[PDB]
Ligand binder design. Sequence first.
Ligand SMILES: Nc1ncnc2c1ncn2[C@@H]1O[C@H](COP(=O)(O)OP(=O)(O)O)[C@@H](O)[C@H]1O
Ligand SMILES: Nc1ncnc2c1ncn2[C@@H]1O[C@H](COP(=O)(O)OP(=O)(O)O)[C@@H](O)[C@H]1O
Lengths: 732, 58, 46
Amino acid sequence: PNRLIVDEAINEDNSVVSLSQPKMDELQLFRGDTVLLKGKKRREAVCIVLSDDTCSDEKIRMNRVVRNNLRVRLGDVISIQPCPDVKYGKRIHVLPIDDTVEGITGNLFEVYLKPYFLEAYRPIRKGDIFLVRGGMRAVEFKVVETDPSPYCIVAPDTVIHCEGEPIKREDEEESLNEVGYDDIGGCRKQLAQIKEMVELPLRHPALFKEIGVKPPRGILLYGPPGTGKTLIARAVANETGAFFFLINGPEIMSKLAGESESNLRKAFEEAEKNAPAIIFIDELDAIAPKREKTHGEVERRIVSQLLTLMDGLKQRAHVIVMAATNRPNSIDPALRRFGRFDREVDIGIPDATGRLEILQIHTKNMKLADDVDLEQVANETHGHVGADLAALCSEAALQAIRKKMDLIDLEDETIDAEVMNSLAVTMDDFRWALSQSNPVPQVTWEDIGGLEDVKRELQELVQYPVEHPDKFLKFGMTPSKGVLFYGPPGCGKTLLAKAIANECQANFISIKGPELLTMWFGESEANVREIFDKARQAAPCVLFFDQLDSIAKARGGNIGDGGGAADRVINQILTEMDGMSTKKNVFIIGATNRPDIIDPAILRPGRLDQLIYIPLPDEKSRVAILKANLRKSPVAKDVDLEFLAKMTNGFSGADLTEICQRACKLAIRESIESEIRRERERQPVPEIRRDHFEEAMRFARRSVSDNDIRKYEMFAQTLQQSRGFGSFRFPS
Amino acid sequence: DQLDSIAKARGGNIGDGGGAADRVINQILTEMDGMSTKKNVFIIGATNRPDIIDPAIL
Amino acid sequence: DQLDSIAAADRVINQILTEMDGMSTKKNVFIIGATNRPDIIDPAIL
Ligand SMILES: Nc1ncnc2c1ncn2[C@@H]1O[C@H](COP(=O)(O)OP(=O)(O)O)[C@@H](O)[C@H]1O
Ligand SMILES: Nc1ncnc2c1ncn2[C@@H]1O[C@H](COP(=O)(O)OP(=O)(O)O)[C@@H](O)[C@H]1O
């Protein structure tokens, strides 16, 4: 019940807080009682509880000033408890801020403190902040000294003196703007994990004792630089009751030989002295590299001493040591073992919403106009780490100032107020920042013309499992992962593979047999294993094997001596695909120019079970191919693509692409003539002229003879005659 | 798996690494049955072409 | 130079084929091949 949501106070002063009647009853509390408030950044205060109906059950009506004292904002969670044994204060010493005391001709105590604390009966704590209105400037007071410590009620007979050294404005501001868990963005999950491995053992060590475990004494943070590991150290420093101490890797290296070890030993001694304690080690890889590869023996000494003191604690001191590294591999491998920095956390690059949060955090102090939208900037900056985002914000503010360099004058002793109030950041500044700062196939189904059945089948095999995983899990059948494309050359099999990869948004890897065949003994099979491993790394992926006939042949019969090695290659592929049954996301598509010699074992169901015959495009598909090729080129209306498709009976898709290439080349040539004519006029046709089609087609010939095509039909008819279960109906 | 690749009739392919395949076969022969105490190592082979496998392997 | 010395298809011509296919994306670099006799060079080059 102690948790409550920070809520505004309508009339309550700083030394009083308000609760709802049901909530105040729930705590077994009386009206006017002294209460203790705990808020973020380990900020503790004491106030007087009040009854109010407007105050919500889950909200506490409480002011701005104590919010600053508690370092909390609206909506923040603070823990409220009864405060017992709140003795009346004998004497309080308060240090006001430097800014507030300026211009106050009269004494602060007489003008402000004396009437404020007359019959106050207010309980206060060391470091408590309160505000008093009056004079030319409202005055802030901070209670540095309390007597008796720590909780003291200000009675009228209590003497109050503001004499001493007033608190500097920057010193109070730094604590006010000090970091907590909210200031770090994009790693809330990692903050929760770090709380679990670190904060949880410290708050409840007996809980770890009961279950028969020893808490992880040391934890490691690794990832790209700038992700905020030191910032996480700052946050855990501010918001943990456990005593926090600093060890800096550069600071460790700064000491003389034989003094870094002394500093670290006294560090662990101090940590084990206080109960509890947390140590953080930034740049652990800097002072703890591998002892196998080390330039100086002193570094080996410091690594060994760190190991010895790491084993020195016996899990009873309850001190957790934290380490941050940009390169975890540089850290000595011993530290990664058990009983020591075994627990690793990777602070990956922030996502879109995380980087949005980081941008908001970085820009909260800066002014933001109505036009600026941080979500857009986050959308464009895919890869910037948090430090890059901070630099982006700073250079956006720099553009804001730069746009006024014509208005402002540096030589002046003072700056203009008009330009200053006109000065702010706009969208253009963040655009410049985005431009300056530095952190799948193109082919689509619309590009392909014809072969609609093949397109639908490819969508069925690959796109549907990722679209509908639940349906596949329900029917309990693993999706097929094998497609073979066989047909005459230049019919868009590679286009089909690229299109399906683009539609499914998976990495596309394409390779051919001669790329793999090589000359050394085991090299080709190693290449096959490497390409399959590469497909695994880029999962989900579409692995495309072009010229499958060259790489896969009938093992039983091969004329050449080296064909035996070729046999070996095929075997490797077989085994690889047995490993590819595990990776359902990796989809293997094999296009072969001639499928008769393809090994029967590779076409076995479970490796390449789908066989697709890609024939020559018909008249309709030829029209579609001409449309696709002529999308980019404006064309005259006189040409009839239907007639072109009808005439080009023996041509493939590549033939038509070369056709359009030559046609538009002669279009360039007539453009040369037109521009020469324009130059003569100094001293145009919108679309392609028809005689260019006339001449361009003459250059083209038939790519593939019909005999190979009838061979393809013979293979397809063997496949069809094999599928002889058409006359199949279950009994009754 | 696919033992017929690593195991062949010795001398079948002259250009298979200059006898490196035959040396591999001899090494496998010594490692399966040689002058070492047999451990609890059960060797399973799978092949589609058993007639090409070395008779000493079988 | 002397592309005919290499020369229907083999490993090296396939490497160069894939490289020029990927290289067509970069228009700025200009690819020139001078061979003495073009009859024997692979038509995929053409
Ligand atoms: N998630 C985040 N939220 C807010 N600021 C961040 C975040 N990540 C990084 N930063 C900023 O970027 C900097 C990252 O530095 P850091 O990675 O801690 O240095 P090192 O790697 O040397 O310890 C910090 O100063 C911090 O202000
Ligand atoms: N249906 C089609 N639509 C558009 N272009 C096509 C089509 N079929 C083939 N092509 C053209 O043929 C050329 C080569 O095709 P390719 O992908 O090499 O076929 P294959 O997979 O048979 O080798 C491509 O540049 C492409 O422009």
